[PDB]
Every structure is written in structure tokens, then in C-alpha cells.
Design a protein around this ligand. Structure first.
Ligand SMILES: CC/C(O)=C1\SC(CCOP(=O)(O)OP(=O)(O)O)=C(C)N1Cc1cnc(C)nc1N
Ligand code: SF4
Ligand SMILES: [Mg+2]
Lengths: 286, 560, 576, 231
């Protein structure tokens, strides 16, 4: 069990870590099947955990690693943690491509404003003027990419974060939770201190698609809400379970897929290859 | 040994025509080695095959029979033609960078061929009008040249149906049609690959396209005989970075995962390769060597990429590298590569020249056939430490879902946690490197090398050309290197020990194989035969250059 | 007379400034310094230390053994107690602390110190370590930084400064020109100019080298050893230029771009170079692995570009904050398809500065990428450098961009100043795509000829350095060179390879010809330099001294390995 | 393909740009220089060309798979810098270029039909002229936003951006298929302009024109850099 946590005193990650552990306990998932896949950075050092498996990746590549794990063994429950530099700079391509695919997994973004572990350079979420580059809009990009469950949360409201994380896992398809995490060591602005309100408050807020005719209308409401910043919403901006996951699209093609997954197939018995090649070779006889 | 070429414009049934000819001639009982040459598109292509009594593993620059329907093909090939030249009569009076050089080197070209080639004009346009009311040049065509061979039309009608004659008069075991892509595809399927990810790239897409077409797979049991239905997941990644990273992800699960790329692509996978090496992950990359650098010659071949793949990646880590020489080996090596990946818990690069990918041949079943599985040091469960310190460097391998484990690209302790501890680093780095030393004692040197006759040192596709040069002329020991890491240094050195001429043959400017040979043995080669023009080695051209090396003592022969 | 100083501390707690103050003041009094920072891939909480050598004579390295340990906490004591030889300054207010108490220390380290101390055997407290120190002749000095903190970092360095017996008026200046001494000065008593000199680390030497060398476009992705090079360049991006024949000053800008990834970074710089600008990037192992595709295109289209490659611990993420010499064969043969690359490696801070300029000149003359290897030790080590007449070689500048010549080098025009075609696909003299066999053979040849020409025009003697002279040769490159030159001042021929491509074949054969012992010394496992030497010369090294533990070579440890090779033997000595 | 290329020549001619300062960058004439780059990397190359010599006019031509597949990380990164150049896009699921371009934003975003070539040509003239990073998605039911009641995609006051973004995004979900300009916001400064504000000499003596060398002698002066390092 021993492994020491070297986050700075005060770091939004302590919160993400806590919400995520709690998310899994409460959800009654077999921890034997949980795998947390993380990119590079401060955020990448989770775990740090409870006996969960952890795959610490390459910078920007978590989503590609996570997709291979998931399609080989769809029983697993794959969570991805990455930094802002990670998922939206160097890994932005993997980020957009993943929404085309709709794999059942959770992507959790550590919205830091900075390259923390590399000594504080502006991340792709830092606004110009804080810095010569604009910030991207994570939630809007996810919706465009896109991306069948989307949400924002705050690392200093573990309660709310834990419930986002839970419904993201329950969600069948690719979820994104964008988490605002302060960095007392390198983000002088966006302290905490630094405003937040919850969408779930608003009188008639309904982010779930019930029928496919209300797709565009739910998108448009999610984009409007993604534009507020300065004096900041939080919660589930959009959700749509009518879109089939990638694993459902493999079945509509390969019925035996979900019954006999790649991770369970026995290619060998006592070092003897079990796969039948004979029609492949027969179709090529002279 | 006869040498046949058909040529013309792309998408003009010249490929199906070639297919049929080759089916016909092969089902009679002859052997074929075929290969196609083409530009990146309209443009001109041709198919060159050699027809022979015994196994044939090469082509020739020179052409015995040339089938041609336009002026372009005559112009392209007339200089190489030796015996017969079938041509369209309708193009007899057609005028013309390749073109500039041909302006001094159609009538004029036949003028040249006469002085000395038998010259068969054909009323192609006329023959086709006589099929009416009853792209047909192609069939006669293959018919004229087929009766030339003096084989019974019964076999060539067979071939046409599973997809003129008398214009001219006659002049002259279980087996499989395999190209390199197909042979690898079928190796991987048989070898247990249940996850292939890839990005489309010229020589390598065909392999994954075949695997996806045959993803619906059937597995038996030797005991009960109970057959079970399986599925190979094939993902087209967003890029080559995604491709390796998916494969590596999938391998942590226990599945045999692979990918296939070519040069541009391999350069993008170097980061992933390093993670797999750091984390002791089995994964194989099929590396199709094509003309480089950079984009280079996408439709052409080379042997330019050897030291790079052996030494790719920015620290030190074990990787196994394996090089196929013909179509049968391509099928064997795909399976050997998987097993090696799993036994030594490390990435394996399977090198395959582009020449072998697209070229095809008639392969006799006894290849073979005996192929087993080795899953290495693998546990079901599940206190377990992924990277347990072990004498042979190979830690017992549990899979995701079966044990609590931690993987990381940072240096790590036995748990897989991050450590910058001086003693752990020394021990843990050594452990990964030991596995290569263990592979060097445990893989017999004689398996990493193939020896014919009894010095020419080579690897890959020129090996088959050099074997075909061990009947014609009274010529050497032929040494094919098959595994470059761990390199068979003691055996290669011993084999280099008692001779006057040591020649190296390879498709590189730098003669990389000499560089490697020298690095591990200290011994130098006496001569070198090189080529880097994007074209395979040819039987005749290489014969003549070998004479230059042996007669005139020429140190570095370049094949233009 | 060389003196070993160490100050330790938790990452984030003061430090840096404590070592840079002490270091400045000792240097201002005309003494020479070589200082090195050892720290974790961490921002706060882990143990860092600064090792400095003090000397009357130029110095190029550090030792395992310490003569003065300054410690303010308890971790420092445990981390180093074994290596102290003379004085150990400690905080008395943490004399009671157990090993089990110390949360920061990697558990694997904590065990070793626990037993040690149990065998021996003392308490497994700080006291226990301090008490071990005493029975190995270490003079303890208790300190009450707490008592002083309320009766009023600096106190630690001030004590150790008094131990030297130097003038307090440098410490002061050192403390004034940067931002107590009255008290701490008087608790223990003493126990022990010529030319301009500059403080440089490898990053700053390269950055200043690039600014002076004409670099006006630099792209980078943040990565630990090399984001400091850019940043420094960005901070001084507004630069002045003056020619003699008019005298007129003219102000310019170095565009520094923080790219989205390393692919982008190399691709922007290549893009910049077509314009005629001198362009460069800076990266380390993970980033270089991503740049290989870009290097290929630059090789193919004969684009000058320099990549400064800092070598950190690998493979993969590896040891982000630690050094190695692991990356030699890889950069030399990086890329598919064969193309000229020039590869250069600095062995000290001054050479870092000069090679950066030389690399720019070679890029431009042979119209090809140039990789400049700098170990991460050089980047984080710093030293007092004396005056170490340096020119520009813009090569063959002025239409067919890839016109054939016998030396392989086509006259170069820039975008805007001529109509040009560039492509990654094989191409003819105009830069258009050409699969033609004769063009192919000729064009591939022409690129490759450039390197044969470099092989002739660069004398072999400028591609190496030679020190000492004897019957027992040592071959090395990079930072251990400095360590071995310091060893030559107290009781062999030392050859330092500088350029590995084109490699100085014949000079190395020649120089190996009459010896009993040939020893490679390098921070890697495979002994990569020996493999290169054997590749080019056919000859073998007799012995190796190797180290792959993330730490630089140290003066005392490497001296004990030499003896153990030379007097004694053993083929292969692994440093601990 | 033949038509898209043609429409680029004619917009260049019609805006009166000097052909010796036009670079066309693409993935995998007259006297226009062409740079055939690597797969999915044209934008990074273009960025480098443009920032060394801002007097050049840099057009990026790419395929749907080139940008937005392999290049999708360069695509969104470019939207953060706002470099004055133009990206022409020659058009499992599929992505929405317009929405992704606005979300990553991308300060001129448009759609043309491959013929109307007239309309495309006027879009290309708008893009070039536009100060910042323009994208034209080109398609190879259709109607022109240009011909609606009060369709004004141009932001002219800081308070309009939200309303302009919301309308662009709505129109990008229509599939009636809109073509034209969805969004233009020139209140966001160019990357070059952002360099100027910190390094004022940049535009009037550009990195490509700086003489770093006179007859072999390095003309840069480092003495003040070396003085701050003195012991
Ligand atoms: C282990 C530490 C290390 O080497 C790091 S950490 C790091 C962090 C980037 O910050 P982020 O926003 O994704 O994470 P944060 O630290 O949580 O802000 C980078 C870019 N790197 C460097 C790096 C750069 N490029 C590649 C390809 N790989 C890398 N590891
Ligand atoms: S740096 Fe910012 S992010 Fe990295 S640990 Fe210290 S605080 Fe948390
Ligand atoms: Mg971050």
C-alpha cells in the first residue's frame, strides 16, 4: 500500500483524487475492473490512490491507450485523467477523434491554466493577457467533436464532482468532465477566492436528450452556457444516450464480439495454435 | 526460366490479364514469381513474371516475351526485349525525362528490336470488331503469348471462367498464391492477433484490409474438438501515434496486438515504442520498408531502414528486430515475432521490404505447417508486483482485470510506482537490458541466420535473387541475416573467417549491413554491391555486377 | 586545493538563492566554482541539494564526498551523513527525529539508512546518523536556527563562509545585490580577479550562443531541461545589431514561439528556415522522438535547422530531472531513408556556447539538420568561466533549388526572393516530384555526397580534443571529460570526441595504435561510444567504466574506478 | 480540385497581391512557390514561414483527412494564435469543421460550394483580406446566408461576440444547407500584432530581413548579455 503524494500544499488535484475514489466506492464497481489511465504532468501522478490499477501514459496519448484497453476488454471501466496541456494541446487530435468513435469511458480534464510540472508555462486554457495565446473552450470543443456527455465541475466541491463522475461512468458512451483546478504554485490568477454557480439550480435546466428531434435544441442550449465566463456555470451541459457506442457498432457486424471479447479468446492450448486457417489458405490454392 | 512482361495504362484491365495468365500457367504445374511496378496515381505500369520448372524468387531486367497494346509500353520496354515482342499494328507509326532519354537510346523502336527480335503485330482493333454483334486486347494479349508457350488451351479457358489462339504458332504438390501482405496477415490471424490498429499507408493498408475482411474467426480445441467463434478488432486510428498507443493499450489486456506501417509512420511511433520497452509490453510492428527519406517513393522499395529501427528511441531498452527474405518467411516470421514479443516481453519490429509486399509467387505447402505458440511467463492472477526483480530480467506477466498493477513511462520500482532512487534505477535499468542478453543465449544463433551453398552477406529480398544465382554460372556461400537484435555475432564472425572475397549486397547507399557487421564483429567486408533507385535487385543485373566484383576487384559496385 | 560544499533542503524552501548567494560571494573573492543542482521530478516537498567545488584553480566537476554539509531540516542529514568527511552543520531543533518520521524520503532510501545504522549500530534517529558521523572524524556543529529566527538560510551559508575565513564584505555585497550576519558569524571560527569571468549554465551558454549566432526564429515545447533556454531567449528577444562599415545600430526581434507539440515545433522552425532565417529548436528525449519525421523532411529538402538535444534519463518519460549519455546512436541514425545529419556534443559550458554557433554555421554550409547533444548535467551545472574570434558561415547563398554540383551543395535562395518548390516526395532539380530512376539515383547520391565533403572540409583534429599523454588511452565525450581532466591534475591520454557525424575515423584508429589499456568512460549501459569506435575503426576498447543511475560522474568515484581498471583490471566497472 | 485551385489564382490576382510573395503550403503558376509538406503538418510549417516573413501571403490547402484527422491538433492550436493566413479545406462518424473552428476559434469561418466558383473566389478574397486566421470549408438544398433578411456575421463591438457565436453555431447544425461567411471577428489581434506590442521593431525589420552577418562577422552585440553574467 505505501506510495507518497508530492502535490503542493493546496492543489485542486487532492479534490479530484477524493471525488474519484468516492465515485467508484459508492458506485459499487468491482475495483478489480477499474483502470485509471493518466497522461503526463502533475495531474498524471494519480494514483496515489484503494487497490485500483493505474496506467501512466505518454504526454497527450491517454485517450489512445484507453481506447485499446477498452475495446480489447469492454468489461473494464476505464477512466482517463489528463492535464489541459495534455488533452487540449499535444493530445487535441486524439481529443477530437475520440468523439467520432464514442467509446464508453470517462475523460477527466485537470483545467490548471498552466504546465505545472514543467514550471508554469501558459496552458491552452489560459486566456490571452494573463501570455500571447488564446484559450480554447473545452466544453464547446467537446460538443463540436463530439461527444455524447459533457460537464464541468469544480475541484473544491467534492460532493458535486463525485456525482458528475458517477453519472459519467453510468453513461454509455464517451463522457467529458472538465474540472477547474487551482494551482497555488503557478496560477497567481484563478485562485479560489476567484463566482462559481451551479446550472442544476436554474428553474427548467434539462441537458438530457429524450427523443432525437430535440438533439439540435439541447446542443444550442449547451453552447450558450459554455460561453459564460467572468462573474461561471457548472454541472451537466449536455447528454445524449441515443448515439450508439463504438462497442455497439462492433457488434452490428460481429455478434460474437461482446460474448467472446479479444481479451478472453484462447489463441493457444498447450502451445498449440487453435485458430482455423484452412479456408484462408484454401481460397488461395492453385 | 522464361521472362514475361505485360504493360500499359493503369485501370485498363492489365492486372486481371496478368492474374489470369499467371493462374493459367501455374495450374499447368509451373512456378511463378510476379511483381508490379507503378507510379503514384493514368500512368504506365507493367507486370513482370518469371515462369520456371522449379521454385523461382526473382525477376530480370531483360524480357523474353513482351505483350503490348499502346506506343508507351513499346517505348518503355523495347531496349530490354530479347525474344518476342507482341505489339498493336495501329500504333506502328507513333512519335514520341524518361522520354527525352528514349529520344536517343515506335517504328524506330521496332527497327531497333529487329536487328534481334521476332516481331508480332496484332490487328487488335479488328479482332474486337469481329467480336460483335457477338478492353479485349488484353485477352489476346495473354492468348498469343500463352500459345507461344505451347501449353493446352484447356488450362487458360479454366482461368478466364474463374474470373486469337492460332494467330501465332507455338514457340516453346499443393501450392498457394501469397503476396507479402497476405502472408503476414495470415501469420497474424493464425498467430493469435486479436487487435490490429493502423493508419493507411501504401504498402501496409492491404494487410489490415485483409485482416478486417477476415475478422470473423474460428478457433478449435485439440482435446474436445469444440469449435468457437471469435472476432479480430481492427481499428483505423486517427494517426500513427494513436495506432501504436492503442496496440500497447490492448496488449496490457493480454491480447496479442499489432500494427503495420511504413517509414514515415514508423518515425511517428518511436515515442510509443519507448513506452512499450520501458513497460515490458509485447507488441509487434510490421515495418514495410519503402523508398525514403520522408515521403520518398511511396510505390517503390528500399533497404534503407535498418540501423534506425534497431536503435530508435531515446534511452536504452530491449527490442527484437527480424527481417524476412521471401513470401514464406513473411508468414513464418509474423508468428515468430508474436511469440518473441511475448517470451521477452518487449517490442518486436518485423522488417519487410516493399518489394516482398506487392510481389507474389507460387509457394509449396511445406512451409510449415511446425508452428507453435509461446505466451511466455504469464500468470492468471493476482502482493503481486509487475516488475519483480528476476535473474533473467523477465517478470511474471499478469493482465489488466486480473491483478492490481501500475504502469508508467517514468522509471519505476517493482510495483510500477515512480522512483528516482539511485539503487533501484541501476537495478531496474539492468533488468530490462538483461532480457536481450537472455535472448542472445536462448535463441540459437543458427535460427537467426540462413546459409545457402558453401561469402555473400545479405538480408531480405536480394537473398532470393542470390539463391536463383546458385545454379546459373558456376558461382559462393550465401549468408542471410534474419535477426539483427540480438545479432548473431559469434556465428557471423566464424562464418567470415576463411575466404578471400566477402561481398555485401543491399539496397542502401551507406551499406548499413557492413556497418552492423563491423560493429559487432570488428571485421570488414571486402566489397559491396549497392542499389538505391527504388527498384528491386534483378537476377541478370546482379549476376553481371557480381562479375565486376570478382573479376575486376571493384570495391563498391553501384547498380544504376 | 579543492573543497566540497553541499547545501540540502526541501524543494520550495528557500535554497537556490542560498547557494547562488554563497556561490557568488566565494567567486567574487577570486575563487573558482563548479556547482550542480540535484532535485526530483517534483515542484514542492522533495529533497534537493547543491554540490559546489571551491578551488584556486579552474574546476570542472563535483565529488561524492562532502567537506561541509549545511542542513536546516532533518532529511538532509539522513540523505548525506555517510558522505560528509569534515564538518556537518545541523539544526539542533530536529535532533530527535526518527527515519519513520520523514514523509518526503523515498521509502527505498529510508530502509537502507535504517539498516545501515542498525548494523553498526546507532539509534536510527538523526542522533544516530550524527553519532556515526563523529566516529568517522566528522566535526558536528549544532545550530539553533529557531533561537535566531525569533531573536531577530542565510545563517547556514554565513557559518560555512566563516569556516573558510574569507572577508565578510563579499557575502554582504552578495546579499545586498540580490534582495542576521552579525549573530551567526560569531559562533564558530575559521578552519581553512586576474580576468573577467562569467557565471554560466549550459542553457544560458547555448541561448547566448544562439542569440549571437544569428538565430531569429526559435520554437519549442516546454520540457524540463530546455524550456529555460527559450524563456531566456524570449526575455532578451529585442536585440541590437551593428556593422563596422556604417557603424549604425538597428534593432531586431527573435520570434520565440511556444508550440502545441514537438512536431509543430520542428515543423515551424523548418518552415522558418525556408525564408532564410537561422532557426532552431530545443528539446529532450521524449521531444526528439517526436521530431524524427520532421528531421527527415529537413534532410530531404536540404533545410538548415539546429536542434539542441538535451539528454536526460530514459527511456520514455524516464528520469525528467536527471542526466544520461544514453542517446548517441539514436540521433546519429534517426530517420527513415538515409540523409546527411551533422552531430556535435559539448563537454563543458564554454563548448556549449561555441558549438551552438558552430552548429548554426554547419547547418547553413551543408544545408542539412544539425543535432547538438548537451547532457542535462551541463544544463543544470554552472561555473565560473574565463574568456572562452568566432565568425559566420552562411554557406552558398544567392532558378533550380536542387541543381546538381560535384560537392552536392545547391545554391540557396529564400522564399520571397525566388520561385521554389519543396516536397517530401523524391524530387528533381526544380523540386517537383520525380519517380524517374536516373534522377532518383543522382539526387539521393547528391544529398549523401554532402557528408563526404564535410568529412574532408572539417579537419579531423577539430572534431576531437586531446589531453594528457601516456600508454593508458581513455575515450569519452561530454561531461565526464571535465571530470577526467580534473583527475589528470593528480597522478593517461584523454580523447574527447566532439563530432560524431561525420566521425573522425582515421585519427581515432591512429590514436588507439600503441596502448596496453583502452578505456571507454560514459553514462550508458550498452557502451555506445565503443560500438561507434568499433563500427568505424574495426578496433575494440579493452575496458569500460559505466554509470546509468541518473547521476553525473563524480571526481572521487571515477578515480577509484580507474585504479580498479588500471592497477587491478576487470573489463567492466559499474558506478554506484 | 481544378476549380478550387483556379479560384485561388483569381482571388490573388483580383486583390492585387504580388505573386513573388505568395506561398501555397499543402500536405501530402505563373511563378507561385509551393511547399509540399508532411501529412497533416501544413499549418505548423505555414505558421513558421509567416512569422519569419510577415510580408508573405500564406495559403494552406488541405484535405478533410489531412487537417481535421491527422492534423486536428494543429487545427485547434492555430485557432489560439490567430496567425494571418488562410486555410482552405477540400471536404465511425464525421466532424463539423465550422463548429470545431468556432469552438477553437478561428476568427473568420466560412463555407463555399465547389462551383459556384464566383462565390468561392469572393470568399477567398474576404479570407485573405481578413486580418487573422481564416478557414474556408469547401463542399464538393444549398443556399446563401448572404441572401437572408438581416444576416450579419461580422463582430464590430466587443459586446456582440456571444450573439455572433450563437448564430454561427446554430447555422452550422443546419443540414437547407448554408454557405457563405458564418463568423468574422477582427477585434481579436493577429499573432503578428501581439508580437509587435511586446517587440515593436518586429514588422519594420523582420527576422527574414535581419542581417546577422556582414562579410563573415556577427553583427549582434551581446556585451550587455555577458555583463549581467559577470562574477
Ligand atoms: C515527467 C515530466 C515531464 O517530462 C513533462 S510534464 C509536462 C506537463 C505538462 O502540463 P499539463 O498541463 O499536461 O499537466 P499539469 O502539470 O497537471 O499542468 C510536460 C509537457 N512534460 C515534458 C514532455 C514534453 N513533450 C513530450 C512529448 N513528453 C514530455 N514528457
Ligand atoms: S504545481 Fe500547481 S499543480 Fe503541480 S502540484 Fe504544485 S500546485 Fe498542484
Ligand atoms: Mg496543466
Amino acid at each position: 500500500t505505501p506510495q507518497w503524494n508530492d502535490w503542493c500544499p493546496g492543489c485542486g488535484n487532492f479534490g479530484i483524487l477524493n471525488a474519484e475514489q468516492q465515485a467508484i466506492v459508492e458506485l459499487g464497481v468491482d475495483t478489480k475492473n477499474v483502470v485509471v489511465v493518466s497522461g503526463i504532468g502533475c495531474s498524471g501522478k494519480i494514483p496515489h490512490f484503494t487497490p485500483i490499477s493505474g496506467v501512466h501514459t505518454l504526454h497527450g496519448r491517454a485517450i489512445a491507450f484507453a481506447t485499446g484497453i477498452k475495446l480489447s476488454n469492454p468489461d473494464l471501466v476505464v477512466i482517463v485523467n489528463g492535464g489541459d496541456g495534455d488533452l487540449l494541446g499535444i493530445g487535441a487530435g486524439h481529443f477530437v477523434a475520440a468523439g467520432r468513435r464514442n467509446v464508453d469511458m470517462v475523460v477527466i480534464l485537470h483545467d490548471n491554466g498552466v504546465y505545472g510540472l514543467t514550471k508554469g508555462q501558459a496552458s491552452p486554457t489560459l486566456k490571452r493577457g494573463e501570455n500571447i495565446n488564446d484559450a480554447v473552450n473545452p466544453i464547446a470543443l467537446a460538443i463540436s467533436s463530439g461527444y455524447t456527455f459533457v460537464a464541468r465541475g469544480y475541484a473544491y466541491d467534492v460532493k458535486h464532482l463525485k456525482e458528475l463522475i458517477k453519472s459519467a461512468i453510468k453513461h454509455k458512451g464517451l463522457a467529458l468532465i472538465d474540472v477547474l483546478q487551482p494551482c497555488p504554485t503557478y496560477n497567481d490568477i484563478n485562485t479560489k477566492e476567484w463566482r462559481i454557480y451551479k446550472l442544476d439550480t436554474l428553474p427548467d435546466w434539462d441537458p438530457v436528450v429524450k427523443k432525437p428531434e430535440e438533439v439540435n435544441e439541447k446542443i444550442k442550449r449547451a453552447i450558450d452556457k459554455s460561453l459564460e465566463w467572468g462573474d461561471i456555470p457548472i454541472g451537466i451541459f449536455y447528454q445524449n444516450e441515443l448515439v450508439p457506442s463504438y462497442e455497439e457498432r462492433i457488434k452490428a457486424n460481429s455478434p460474437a464480439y461482446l460474448d467472446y471479447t479479444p481479451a478472453k479468446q484462447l489463441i493457444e492450448k498447450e502451445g498449440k495454435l487453435t485458430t482455423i486457417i484452412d479456408p484462408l489458405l484454401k481460397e488461395r490454392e492453385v | 526460366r522464361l521472362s514475361w512482361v505485360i504493360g500499359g495504362a493503369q485501370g485498363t484491365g492489365i492486372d486481371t490479364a496478368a492474374n489470369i495468365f499467371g493462374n493459367a500457367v501455374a495450374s499447368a504445374g509451373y512456378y511463378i514469381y510476379g511483381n508490379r511496378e507503378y507510379y503514384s496515381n493514368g500512368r504506365h505500369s507493367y507486370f513482370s513474371l518469371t515462369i520456371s520448372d522449379k521454385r523461382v524468387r526473382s525477376n530480370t531486367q531483360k524480357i523474353d516475351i513482351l505483350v503490348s497494346f499502346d506506343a508507351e509500353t513499346v517505348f518503355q520496354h523495347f531496349y530490354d526485349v530479347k525474344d518476342i515482342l507482341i505489339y498493336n499494328k495501329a500504333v506502328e507509326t507513333t512519335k514520341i525525362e524518361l522520354a527525352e532519354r528514349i529520344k536517343d537510346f515506335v517504328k524506330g523502336a521496332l527497327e531497333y528490336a529487329s536487328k534481334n527480335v521476332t516481331l508480332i503485330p496484332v490487328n487488335y482493333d479488328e479482332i474486337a470488331k469481329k467480336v460483335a454483334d457477338e478492353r479485349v486486347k488484353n485477352i489476346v494479349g495473354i492468348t498469343i503469348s500463352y500459345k507461344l508457350l505451347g501449353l493446352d488451351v484447356n488450362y487458360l479457358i479454366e482461368a478466364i471462367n474463374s474470373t486469337s489462339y492460332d494467330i501465332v504458332e507455338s514457340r516453346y504438390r499443393r501450392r498457394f498464391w501469397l503476396d507479402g501482405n497476405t502472408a503476414v496477415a495470415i501469420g497474424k490471424i493464425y498467430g493469435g492477433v486479436r487487435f490490429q490498429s493502423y493508419y493507411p499507408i501504401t504498402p501496409a493498408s492491404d494487410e489490415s484490409v485483409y485482416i478486417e475482411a477476415h475478422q470473423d474467426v474460428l478457433m478449435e480445441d485439440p482435446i474436445t474438438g469444440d469449435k468457437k467463434k471469435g472476432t479480430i478488432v481492427v481499428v483505423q486510428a486517427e494517426d500513427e501515434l494513436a495506432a501504436i498507443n492503442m496496440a500497447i493499450g490492448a496488449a496490457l489486456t493480454g491480447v496479442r496486438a499489432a500494427t503495420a506501417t511504413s517509414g514515415p509512420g514508423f518515425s511517428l511511433m518511436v515515442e510509443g515504442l519507448g513506452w512499450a520497452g520501458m513497460n515490458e509490453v509485447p507488441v509487434v510492428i510490421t515495418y514495410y520498408i519503402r523508398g525514403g527519406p520522408s515521403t520518398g517513393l511511396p510505390t517503390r522499395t528500399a533497404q534503407s531502414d535498418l540501423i534506425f529501427p534497431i536503435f530508435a528511441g531515446h534511452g536504452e531498452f530491449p527490442k527484437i528486430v527480424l527481417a524476412s527474405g521471401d513470401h514464406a518467411e513473411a508468414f513464418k516470421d509474423a508468428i515468430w515475432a508474436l511469440n518473441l514479443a511475448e517470451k521477452y516481453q518487449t517490442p518486436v519490429i518485423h522488417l519487410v521490404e516493399k518489394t516482398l509486399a506487392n510481389s507474389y509467387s507460387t509457394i509449396p505447402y511445406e512451409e510449415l505447417e511446425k508452428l507453435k505458440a509461446e505466451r511466455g511467463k504469464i500468470v492468471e492472477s493476482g502482493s503481486y508486483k509487475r516488475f519483480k526483480f528476476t535473474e533473467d530480467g523477465i517478470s511474471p506477466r499478469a493482465f489488466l482485470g486480473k491483478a492490481t498493477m501500475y504502469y508508467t513511462g517514468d522509471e519505476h520500482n517493482e510495483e510500477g510506482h515512480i522512483s528516482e532512487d539511485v539503487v533501484n534505477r541501476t537495478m531496474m535499468y539492468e533488468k530490462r537490458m538483461k532480457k536481450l542478453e537472455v535472448a542472445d543465449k536462448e535463441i540459437p544463433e543458427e535460427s537467426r541466420v540462413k546459409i545457402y551453398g558453401d561469402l555473400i552477406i545479405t538480408w531480405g529480398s536480394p537473398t532470393g535473387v542470390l539463391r536463383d544465382i546458385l545454379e546459373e554460372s558456376n558461382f559462393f556461400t550465401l549468408l542471410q541475416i534474419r535477426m539483427f537484435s540480438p545479432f548473431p555475432k559469434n556465428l557471423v564472425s566464424k562464418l567470415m573467417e576463411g575466404r578471400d572475397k566477402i561481398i555485401t549486397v543491399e539496397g542502401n547507399y551507406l551499406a548499413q549491413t557492413s556497418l552492423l557487421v563491423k560493429m559487432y564483429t570488428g571485421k570488414d567486408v571486402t566489397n559491396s554491391i549497392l542499389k538505391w533507385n527504388g527498384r528491386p535487385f534483378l537476377r541478370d543485373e546482379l549476376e553481371e555486377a557480381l562479375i565486376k566484383v570478382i573479376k575486376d576487384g571493384e570495391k563498391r559496385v553501384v547498380l544504376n
